[PDB]
Amino acid sequence: KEYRTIKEVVGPLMAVEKVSGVKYEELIEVRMQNGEIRRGQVLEVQEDKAMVQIFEGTSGINYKNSSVRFLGHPLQLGVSEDMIGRVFDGLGRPKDNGPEILPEKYLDINGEVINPIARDYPDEFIQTGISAIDHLNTLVRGQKLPVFSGSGLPHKELAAQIARQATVLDSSDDFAVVFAAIGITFEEAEFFMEDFRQTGAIDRSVMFMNLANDPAIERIATPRMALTAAEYLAYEKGMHVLVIMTDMTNYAEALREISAARREVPGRRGYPGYLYTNLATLFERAGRIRGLKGSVTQIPILTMPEDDKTHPIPDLTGYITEGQIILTRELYKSGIQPPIDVLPSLSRLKDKGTGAGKTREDHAATMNQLFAAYAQGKQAKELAVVLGESALSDIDKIYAKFAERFENEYVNQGFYTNRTITETLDLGWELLAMLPRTELKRIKDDLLDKY
Amino acid sequence: IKEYRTIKEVVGPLMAVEKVSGVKYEELIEVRMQNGEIRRGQVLEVQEDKAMVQIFEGTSGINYKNSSVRFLGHPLQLGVSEDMIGRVFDGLGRPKDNGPEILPEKYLDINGEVINPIARDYPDEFIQTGISAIDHLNTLVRGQKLPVFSGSGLPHKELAAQIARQATVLDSSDDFAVVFAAIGITFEEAEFFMEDFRQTGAIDRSVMFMNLANDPAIERIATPRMALTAAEYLAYEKGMHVLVIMTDMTNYAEALREISAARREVPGRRGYPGYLYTNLATLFERAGRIRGLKGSVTQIPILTMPEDDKTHPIPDLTGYITEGQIILTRELYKSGIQPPIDVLPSLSRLKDKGTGAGKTREDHAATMNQLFAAYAQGKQAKELAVVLGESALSDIDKIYAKFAERFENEYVNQGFYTNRTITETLDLGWELLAMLPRTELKRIKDDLLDKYLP
Amino acid sequence: MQIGKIIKVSGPLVMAENMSEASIQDMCLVGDLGVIGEIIEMRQDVASIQVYEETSGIGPGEPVRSTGEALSVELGPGIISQMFDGIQRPLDTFMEVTQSNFLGRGVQLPALDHEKQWWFEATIEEGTEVSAGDIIGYVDETKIIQHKIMVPNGIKGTVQKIESGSFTIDDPICVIETEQGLKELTMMQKWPVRRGRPIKQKLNPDVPMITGQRVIDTFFPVTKGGAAAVPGPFGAGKTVVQHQIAKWSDVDLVVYVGCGERGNEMTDVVNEFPELIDPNTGESLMERTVLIANTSNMPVAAREASIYTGITIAEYFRDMGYDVAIMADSTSRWAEALREMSGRLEEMPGDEGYPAYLGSRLAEYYERSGRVIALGSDQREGSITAISAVSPSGGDISEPVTQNTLRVVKVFWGLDSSLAQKRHFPSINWIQSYSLYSTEVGRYMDQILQQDWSDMVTEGMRILQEEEQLNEIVRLVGIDSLSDNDRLTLEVAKSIREDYLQQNAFDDVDTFTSREKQFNMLKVILTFGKEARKALSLGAYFNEIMEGTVAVRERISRSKYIPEEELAKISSINEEIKETIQLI
């Protein structure tokens, strides 16, 4: 059925009359006079009239000879068990040349709210891939742990690093990774393209791409497409899913473009007022379900505008993201990779992950001593520069000799080295070479003698 | 009066009534619902046969088809009477306490009328509040608009209650009265006032208008105009010295923006309405003396400064309509100073009118400037002591430092239930000046030192 | 019935015609799916409906049926030990009928179980006149709490027939005469959620609530029916503190409300609440707890109506004569729900985007709680103490939510994350925290104890404020310039904030300190400082009075772990101090 009753074409929006049965937020299809076809959705429906927003804009659309088709279904995603290994774009269609994937069903991408009764707690450690994460800031299956970054920092290499070195200790090929690219350039897009395939980690992951020069509506659907596929594999096929999103600042930027163009009152910093409520609909899609196998876990990557946490984009996530992973530019332009500062970056769920079986007993106590030896070693370097090397005592001198040495080996472990969890604790004791017996009082002393 | 059963639209607290005639602006209405519930209202806009009304209690549970609107034919009025003294009323003047309802001598609009500039008289006589910080350094005068600036959680309700108990005129041939207007306060503060006013017998000299915080926003705006209408009646028609105390004035401004946001009106500074300066002036200017009349109206509006900021619109605009301010600081309240009145930023623009011989003793202005200058150097030496220890303070710097300590604990800190007469306040000021050597007292004339200085 | 027809669906706004009989603020089922909405405005027959759930799939022509009732909650037996969702929908019953893990849109189901048989024990006699709030009988809903079945509001007359037996919440158990006719009333009743319950009169809240926590009950107390705000930043341990107030409080009922809370945080409260044991009975704490839980991604209107649901349920238990305590966590997320609904209605922005009526909504909430006299012919008394957790904007208390909250509450417990990092628990700052009830609690504490308690807490607070002044002095001149007399003020404040203020919530002896033991603990430390100052006045220095009384001061640290059954040791420490220090 084709409708030719286009009355108004004002900017991105479009008015259609002489319709019936149309529902709210229903996906439509526009046939132009030149044969080219564009897709949109209904923003509002009044009586027989309806307002629709075209995704690719309305540039060069003759209202008279054009046609409109109402698809009778909201924005859905065709899910299937064999999505692993295929690259999709923001709308959920195949990006590169692959066989026609026949879905099992179509699910609403807006998701369903989990009953807090059926929501299980997260209590299982997962491979964090980099000694800085496996110890200072551990991550649990079903945890919203973001990585704050900045423009120019090597966060895209860190994002691709976790794509390989993250797995479940008990893996029966069920563990998968859902990597969602949000508004990245072609060079950054091709970086994830060549990395995932040439490393052999693309057949274990479902990646949704989104060109930087793409309709801003697709950047809004890109996370909801990834989280819908993440909930399908975990809650209907019983799989452990790790969700990666880059970049979330481009998502909020695209959401501000849509809000400003849809004639709405902005909030602070020019970003929309319902930005926090909209982000909560994406980060609450992670966690475990009571009485179910598998879980969905998210690691959102976002660049901080002007590297200031008072900005609403890093702050509003703080209201819904348990902890943070701070990437500082001061550690950049150096050999440290990944540049990670363990002073502001915290994790609130390291207790449930640290325990018998999933981790070992010494992992917790060594972490607390490492964090104390680091802050005392860095405090000794700042004091020796200002107050001179004469004011520092013999204990304060040997303390800073390891803040720098640890940053070259503990923080800097290489962007491609796996550095498996077993290798992270063993060299953990190698890190405190001249730490005095008095300084190990905070940790249990039997653990030091046992190891 | 006939009932109108034509309600076309019900949009929020507003309501559209049609096919009416003879309806005036700002007149009161009564709404009868299907249930039979009665709800007051006010006409906000009327054009041709249509009429727009706003309901006070709200609009929940109203069916337009099976409801009716009664137009009373009068605006918001107050039944003034000489029997209102000793009675507690609600926001609009209904008997809140369980007492016999008064027989109104007349009904007056709460807006009132503007005082003729040539008929207004200058402030002259001095009002004894019984508080040393407000009787000596920042004197109160008949017809002055002297507010109190406080913070959230500071003891400004005990201060307002204390002044209402201790305020008096040192003349025999006069009738003194207090019009206490509670504006959007909680029940616990409202219970504190009503219980204290009956505990000390101050209710026999007061007319209280208690408006709670959960009361409708309209009653919060009408509460000052209600009390000020009864104040002008007792002073200008019954010839009484009326002292008006308003609390909280910040709640009044919070009610204006809540109303202004519902009216879709454009906000001014800090979202407050652009007419906040004028709406406040409509209230604060309803005071003063009138030629040929013995009665007078004096206003002490209490307001809480948001974020303890003086540059905030609510405390700033009040300073442009009032003749001073009484600042309450948390630092003094942290040291148990009661009342915590910082005399350094407080001021009375008309203090010179009610001082000197005949209104006070001859040493009022002299000791005022000496105590003020001595307390300045005292807190200057105290602040200078924290920066560079107590070693850098000189002999006089340690003397003034001990003066500032005793000036707070023995002079300002008097207690919310201590009514110092004006002579006790002046004699006490000379006792604290005895700490300083006679050489430091440059402003006080040598003849005054030989007469009062111990 | 009359069924309206939708004419426009624009986001959360749905307009339907042929709704003339409907009234404002009435709930209604929208569309074929049956989603719930609220009529906000009505222009002739056409009414604008504010849906609560998503409208993806709703269109013109679908029917709309008015429920004829505003947002109300069912009040009767079977409400205790339940998990609600802000609009009083049992999530456990929801999961049994829907048979799915996720919340389903368009699902309506009664709150209380209309099939469970309850035994009604009639205490009223036939022929006795009754009024609104009069008790006709009781039902033992739990082993701890008796459910007083009372006459609903607006029913007056004499009862003709009333008998005891086993009935459900829909079976008519009593008939009362009215001017209209005979009126059969069940043991359950509804009540609007945005309208307070009528009372005889509200009273001043003067009875201090025994919280058990020494820092609160001594310096910053809260009376029965009073209010209190809590920041609760990260790592401050507010989760452990809320449980201590929920277990060792003399209130009869606890109503926990979660208004738009994080899901992971919410599932913690769901798990760790049926684990709390009752101090006296020993059963689960859910036998006296009604819980309400809302996820952040849940419908916005459910997160706004959550704070109004718990306070309405608490008023029902308060009318029966019980002392209820409602915990609101986190009231900041509820303020962000209003900021979302205000934007959905295109309202004028207030401070930081929050609506201009944010203060009035907060005032309406805390003004409904308090010690009041319930309706009836016996003038029974109930109370609702309000405890709320205000999530700041990263720790800064300049948020409009906290400032508008503190203007109507009289108690503020300042949780400091800096004290949590210093192993000081409960991490409550003793300078920024305050309570405008200490003057009133001081009168009550001096009466029942017959001791001078008001002057002890005052001096103990003074040496903690003098500690703050001397702290910056020590950090400025050092430790060689401080006075000898002022050294004791720092040594008794160290002996106060450690031997008294520090309280372990997991130690079986220290998790609760009786009102009598707080006085004995406070006196020993204060008398130690008073006996040392008078001794210092004549030939005494610190090297001999502190290093010669180490056996006595070490004893004070273990005094907090003394058994509450005897408590004979602490009273013997007072006379023991004056004996050892006089020999020097």
User: Is there a contact between A273 and A266 (Cβ–Cβ < 8 Å)?
Assistant: yes
Domains of chain C, earliest start first = 1-71 (no CATH), 72-115+186-435 (3.40.50.300), 116-185 (2.40.50.100), 436-584 (1.10.1140.10)
Question: Nearest C-alpha of chain C: how many angstroms from B162?
Answer: 18
Which stretch of DSSP H or E encloses residue C122? strand C118-122
Give the list of residues 6+ apart from residue A216 with CB closer than 8 angstroms, or none: A254, A255, A257, A258
Compare all CA atoms of chain A with the CA of C62 and give the residue at the minimum distance.
A21
Phi, psi (rounded to 5 degrees) for B11: -120, 100
Classified as helix, coil or strand, A299 is strand
C368 interaction partners in chain B (CB closer than 8 Å): 214
DSSP character string of C69-113? S-SEEEESTT-SS-EE-SSS--HHHHHHHH-SSBPPTT----SS-
Q: Count CB neighbours of B73 within 10 A.
A: 12
Residue B407 gets which letter from DSSP?
Answer: I
Half-sphere exposure of C158 (CA within 13 A, CB side): 6
Phi, psi (rounded to 5 degrees) for B387: -75, -45
Range of the domain at B335: 1-454
User: Is there a contact between A412 and A337 (Cβ–Cβ < 8 Å)?
Assistant: yes
Read off the tokens for C3. Answer: 């069924």
Half-sphere exposure of B300 (CA within 13 A, CB side): 28
| CATH number (domain holding residue A299) | 3.40.50.12240
> What Cα–Cα distance (Å) separates residue C213 from each residue in B131, C242, C245, C385, C445?
40, 11, 8, 16, 16
Read off the tokens for B190. Answer: 């409202």
3-state SS record for C544-581 = HHCCCCHHHHHHHHHHHHCCCCCCHHHHHHHHHHHHHH
Write down the residue that tokens 């596929």 correspond to: A229
Q: Does B64 touch chain C (CB under 8 A)?
A: yes
Question: Nearest C-alpha of chain A: how many angstroms from C254?
Answer: 19
Strands A288-289, A119-120: pairing kind: antiparallel
Closest by Cβ to C10, choosing from A44, A267, A277 = A44
User: Is there a contact between C485 and C537 (Cβ–Cβ < 8 Å)?
Assistant: no
Cα angle A240, A243, A249 (rounded to 5 degrees) comes to 170
Q: Does C180 touch chain B (CB under 8 A)?
A: no
Closest by Cβ to B271, choosing from C22, C351, C406 = C351
Which stretch of DSSP H or E encloses residue A177? strand A176-181
User: Is there a contact between C268 and C260 (Cβ–Cβ < 8 Å)?
Assistant: no
- What amino acid is encoded at B178 in this protein? V
Which stretch of DSSP H or E encloses residue B446? helix B446-452
| Best CA proximity match to A342, nearest among A364, A365, A322, A372 | A372
The answer for A 356-375 residues in CB contact with C (under 8 A) is none
Q: Count CB neighbours of C450 within 10 A.
A: 7
Environment class of C561 (CB within 10 Å of its CB; exposed 0-12, middle 13-18, buried 19+): exposed
The residues that bridge with A140 in the sheet, in sequence order, are: A125
User: Is there a contact between B302 and B244 (Cβ–Cβ < 8 Å)?
Assistant: no
User: Is there a contact between C109 and C97 (Cβ–Cβ < 8 Å)?
Assistant: yes
Q: Does C91 touch chain A (CB under 8 A)?
A: yes
Read off the tokens for C42. Answer: 């009505």
* Contact yes or no for C367 and B10 at CB 8 A: no
Chain centroid, CA A329 distance in Å: 20
Give the list of residues 6+ apart from residue B1 with CB closer than 8 angstroms, or none: B70, B71, B72, B73
Chain centroid, CA C59 distance in Å: 42
Q: Count CB neighbours of A150 within 10 A.
A: 17
Residue B313 gets which letter from DSSP?
Answer: H
Q: Does C4 touch chain B (CB under 8 A)?
A: no
* Contact yes or no for B8 and C364 at CB 8 A: no
* Contact yes or no for C95 and A315 at CB 8 A: no
The answer for A 82-121 residues in CB contact with C (under 8 A) is 108, 110, 112-121
* Contact yes or no for B60 and C348 at CB 8 A: no
- The approach used to solve this structure was X-ray
The resolution in angstroms reads 3.4
Mutation site for B-interface testing, chosen from C49, C179, C360, C385 by largest number of B Cβ within 10 Å: C360
Q: Is the dihedral of CA C418, C423, C425, C429 positive or negative?
A: negative
Q: Is the dihedral of CA B122, B128, B131, B132 positive or negative?
A: positive
Mutation site for C-interface testing, chosen from A22, A24, A48 by largest number of C Cβ within 10 Å: A24
Strands B168-169, B148-150: pairing kind: unpaired
Read off the tokens for B209. Answer: 């208008």
C205 interaction partners in chain B (CB closer than 8 Å): 188
Q: In what order do the strands lie in the sheet with A325-326?
A: A87-88, A205-208, A176-181, A240-246, A295-303, A147-149, A325-326
The residues that bridge with B178 in the sheet, in sequence order, are: B206, B243
Write down the residue that tokens 């006079």 correspond to: A33
Question: Nearest C-alpha of chain C: how many angstroms from B9?
Answer: 4
Strands C381-389, C323-329: pairing kind: parallel
* Contact yes or no for A273 and C91 at CB 8 A: no
DSSP character string of B75-132? -SEEEE-GGGTT-EE-SSS-B-SSSPPP--SEEEESS--PPPTTTEE---SEEE-S-H
Annotated binding residue C94: no
Give the list of residues 6+ apart from residue A95 with CB closer than 8 angstroms, or none: A87, A88, A89, A209
Environment class of B47 (CB within 10 Å of its CB; exposed 0-12, middle 13-18, buried 19+): exposed
Cα gap C211→A18, rounded to integer Å? 67
User: Is there a contact between B65 and B50 (Cβ–Cβ < 8 Å)?
Assistant: no
Per the document, the length of chain B is 454
Cα angle B132, B135, B140 (rounded to 5 degrees) comes to 145
- The domain tally of chain B equals 1
Give the list of residues 6+ apart from residue B75 with CB closer than 8 angstroms, or none: B24, B26, B27, B28, B109
- What amino acid is encoded at B355 in this protein? T
b/e burial code for range B307-332 (CB count within 10 A of at least 16 → b): ebeeebbbbebbeebbbbbbbbbeeb
Q: Is the dihedral of CA C197, C200, C202, C208 positive or negative?
A: negative
Strands A176-181, A240-246: pairing kind: parallel
C336 interaction partners in chain A (CB closer than 8 Å): 276-277
Classified as helix, coil or strand, C379 is coil
Cα gap B296→B383, rounded to integer Å? 43
Give the list of residues 6+ apart from residue C494 with CB closer than 8 angstroms, or none: none
Cα gap B21→C285, rounded to integer Å? 64
